[PDB]
Design a protein around this nucleic acid. Structure first.
Ligand code: MG
Ligand code: MG
Ligand code: MG
Ligand code: MG
Ligand code: MG
Ligand code: MG
Ligand code: MG
Ligand code: MG
Ligand code: MG
Ligand code: MG
Ligand code: MG
Lengths: 76, 177, 51, 136, 117
RNA sequence: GCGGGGUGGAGCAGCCUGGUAGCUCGUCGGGCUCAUAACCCGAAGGUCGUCGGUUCAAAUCCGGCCCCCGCAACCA
RNA sequence: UGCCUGGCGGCCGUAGCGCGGUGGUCCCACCUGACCCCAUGCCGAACUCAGAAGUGAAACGCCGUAGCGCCGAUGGUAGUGUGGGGUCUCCCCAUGCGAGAGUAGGGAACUGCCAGGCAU
RNA sequence: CUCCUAAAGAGUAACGGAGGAGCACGAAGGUUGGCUAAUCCUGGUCGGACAUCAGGAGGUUAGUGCAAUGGCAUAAGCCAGCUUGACUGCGAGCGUGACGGCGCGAGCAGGUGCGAAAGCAGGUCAUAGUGAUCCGGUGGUUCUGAAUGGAAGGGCCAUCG
RNA sequence: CUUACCAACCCGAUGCAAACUGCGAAUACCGGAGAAUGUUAUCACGGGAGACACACGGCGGGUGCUAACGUCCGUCGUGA
């Protein structure tokens, strides 16, 4: 019938890009699905928010037999 | 294990030369006999399906497995998940002791017997045939009969083609019209 | 808009309670669960009661 | 009048018409009518040019229509102010870029194909040219 | 559908978890005739110790090389081979096999021999 | 521009609350009558305006389009 | 040291699929038996246990093969940052960046740890 | 709330283009173990285009309590066993908002479930399912109590309209 | 039985898409390092505001008729 509705933007996306130094608990990326997967020292929240489980620099890699993007923390 | 013993000694070496097999493992085998009883009308009342499966339990001595509807279809007006029919699969010697029980007792009983068909093969060497009457088995007594429901019988063989398939049951003296 | 709010009272002497919802049309049976009672600091059984 | 049998959506954005065309060579017949200009081709213009060519060769040989009007164009009716939602779909167009082959013909002599294409070009809003099949 | 590929699927989840935990795992492979045991480094590419029934040093003292008591011999052997090497706490990786029978007899034997898991 | 409707041949229920087509007339068949009406008795006829979506299932729900009925179309 | 097999990895199609061939001392697979441990919403099929008569048929591994997938330049083209211009719905010039597709071609994976067998 | 417009970080308007929500669930939650679709072909009692059975093809074209999008094979999909972590107190550190707020969260303490164990569990694949404050109700409460002891009332905690 | 015609799937060839993607830039943005340059140009706290009617031009778009010195956003410039 009639349009005119929308929802508030959710501010998704990457918060800390490759090489950035983060503290433990820092949110790395907010996402709906697991577009990015948790690697080493990275947790996956209930809404699939990837957060650093240790200090260090974030690192993006593509691994596995399905070429999936992983995010890990190079502990430094 | 009558025909089971008759299998490993007689029908193997006639078949081994009939197809000129290199290894004995190439000869076809008989894995399982599965008896299906599609009730279909149990949706009206389910008191008749248990005694329906009670018959199939007496034909093979195994408690049947009640199959459920895989998906809802209104063409036969059933919703997915309804108890729609029972089945029993037979392996090992219980398959054999049943496999002779029909070929020597299940064959000489069917009304107006004319012989089985040679075209009822899956195309890869597996046979299937349906019996219309359940009073053809010695177990099920005529006195206790609430309905005349039949059932399907399919023969799962390791054969690769129908020629190797028909050759195996022919070795067991199967009636081929 | 059918689920009614209920409370689960601890079987212990303490008046502590949880609150939850329940569809009283499909599930007429009372709800009983083992939940942590922070007053006695033990896992006791909680029974249903009116809110 | 050509028109999609069904669509995922009824109305589309205006968009732009930049770039050069794809399908720039005669691929089915032997002669083609290639557009050298840029613009839109309504479904009526396509049908009008087809009838002009179909009658030109007295319904002989084969004719291909390489374009298809898949873009809906909306219009607001008269005496209607701005706003109150997008207008209703009135006709369909095919976006044309320079080099697009519009029609192809086969089974007729070249001198007859030129006159057929010349009669059809007079119905189209864009400048066209005559092309022939070449060895790729 | 081979039983092997269906078994690797059963073992993938626990192995990913052990890899994420950075733990040194005790991998067990079971065949109808033999049984095997490996202790892999946390990186998953170094074999620290190993023991199995295809080693004649252990096979000669067994009636049959693929029964339940044969697995207890490998479980006892792999643990004492690892204790003197320096590893004390590991994680048992059943690797798609049910924790029952032979692999269970291998585990508790290694548990009895002083391997903490 | 908003609301309500299109169902046997005719006029109307049922849609709201998805599964099950009902009422009165007419029509067909047999009776009563010398004959017709009235009357009594029995039986048929709709796939629900059309196309599409939702559902296991659509007269019913939700569209689009064909239609008829409406109400409103104001201050210069 | 070489060959061969098993396990765990790296890597994630140049590594896949098909087609052809091939392997059983060991290994592996099928296999044998099943009262019992255990198991089937029925079935020792699977899972599990006890075994070693048979077989490499299947599966798996290996070898070959360009049928397909896959990889893939060079050049050109599209686009585009900045500056300028035109006939300005679209383009052009200077300069920087520069695809996608396609073409030549490549290509029948490579590799680590441990273990066993065999030759040495 | 979801997608597009939105110009490859975030955000971004219109009486712009399309759809949804005002819930549901003590299992549809937790855990352990297992499992892998759609569709089609062939054969087969009643049985039919479509029921259950068997085989092959196929490879997720299926499924997900519901819109869309992003996800999902280690399945987040399907089945069974046992269960109540749909725990209490907290919380490094971040995300997002003018603010009120909203969101994610390892780890710590107490107590608990499942598992042989490593471990996992502070609801559900994620994102909608909602309403500030005042006033008042109900339960609790080593708080207060207008001379004093009580009480009323108030506070604090839990919760309701 | 053969018969104005329509025709799924598959195969070959050819296009189209804001709400298609087995591809994929230039830019922009985030972070790190390094010089030179810039009157700290940056951040925080505090005192005082004003402003919340914008306009046109370029570029990228929605809307409209790729109509409007139209309208609504993004970004830059100028006017203000
Ligand atoms: Mg076996
Ligand atoms: Mg390229
Ligand atoms: Mg953005
Ligand atoms: Mg705890
Ligand atoms: Mg326990
Ligand atoms: Mg959900
Ligand atoms: Mg007092
Ligand atoms: Mg204002
Ligand atoms: Mg304003
Ligand atoms: Mg403005
Ligand atoms: Mg203006």
């Amino acid at each position: 019938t009639r349009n005119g509705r929308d929802s508030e933007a959710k501010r998704l996306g990457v918060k800390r890009f490759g090489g950035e130094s983060v503290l433990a608990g820092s949110i790395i990326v907010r996402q709906r699905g697991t577009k990015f997967h948790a690697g080493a020292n990275v947790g996956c929240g209930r809404d699939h928010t990837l957060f650093a489980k240790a200090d260090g620099k974030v690192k993006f890699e593509v691994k596995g037999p399905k070429n999936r993007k992983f995010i890990s923390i190079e502990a430094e | 294990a009558k025909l089971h013993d008759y299998y490993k000694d007689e029908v193997v070496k006639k078949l081994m030369t009939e197809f000129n097999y290199n290894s004995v493992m190439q000869v076809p085998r008989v894995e399982k006999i599965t008896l299906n009883m599609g009730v279909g009308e149990a949706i009206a009342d389910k008191k008749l399906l248990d005694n329906a499966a009670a018959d199939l339990a007496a034909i093979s001595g195994q408690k049947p497995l009640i199959t459920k509807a895989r998906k809802s279809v209104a063409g036969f007006k059933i919703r997915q998940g309804y108890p729609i029919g029972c089945k029993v699969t037979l392996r090992g010697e219980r398959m054999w002791e049943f496999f002779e029980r029909l070929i020597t007792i299940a064959v000489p009983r069917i009304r107006d017997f004319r012989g089985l068909s040679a075209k009822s093969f899956d195309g890869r060497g597996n046979y299937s045939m349906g019996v219309r009457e359940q009073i053809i088995f010695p177990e099920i007594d005529y006195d206790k009969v609430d309905r005349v429901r039949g059932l399907d019988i399919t023969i799962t063989t390791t054969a690769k083609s129908d020629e190797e398939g028909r050759a195996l049951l022919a070795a067991f003296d199967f009636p081929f019209r | 808009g059918i689920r009614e709010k209920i409370k689960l009272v601890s079987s212990a002497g303490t008046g502590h309670f949880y609150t939850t919802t329940k569809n009283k049309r499909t599930k007429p049976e009372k709800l009983e669960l083992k939940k942590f009672d922070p007053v006695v600091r033990q896992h006791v059984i909680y029974k249903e009661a009116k809110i | 009048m050509l028109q999609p049998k069904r669509t995922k959506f009824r109305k589309m954005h205006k968009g732009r018409n930049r770039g050069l065309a794809q399908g720039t060579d005669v691929s089915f017949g032997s002669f083609g009518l290639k557009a050298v200009g840029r613009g839109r081709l309504t479904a009526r213009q396509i049908e009008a040019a087809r009838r002009a060519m179909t009658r030109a060769v007295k319904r002989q040989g084969k004719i291909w229509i390489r374009v298809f009007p898949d873009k809906p164009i909306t219009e607001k009716p008269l005496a209607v102010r701005m706003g109150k939602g997008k207008g209703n779909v009135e006709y369909w167009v095919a976006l044309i870029q320079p080099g697009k082959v519009l029609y192809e013909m086969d089974g007729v002599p070249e001198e007859l194909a030129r006159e057929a294409f010349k009669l059809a070009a007079a119905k189209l809003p864009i400048k066209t040219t005559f092309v022939t099949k070449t060895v790729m | 559908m081979d039983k092997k590929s269906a078994r690797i699927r059963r073992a993938t989840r626990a192995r990913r978890k052990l890899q994420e935990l950075g733990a040194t795992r005790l991998v067990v492979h079971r065949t109808p005739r033999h049984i095997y045991a490996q202790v892999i480094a946390p990186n998953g590419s170094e074999v620290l110790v190993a023991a199995s029934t295809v080693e004649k040093a252990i096979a000669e003292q067994l009636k049959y090389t693929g029964n339940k008591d044969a697995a207890a011999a490998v479980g006892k052997a792999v643990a004492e081979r690892a204790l003197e090497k320096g590893i004390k706490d590991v994680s048992f990786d059943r690797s798609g096999f049910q924790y029952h029978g032979r692999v269970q007899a291998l585990a508790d034997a290694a548990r009895e021999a002083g391997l903490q898991f």
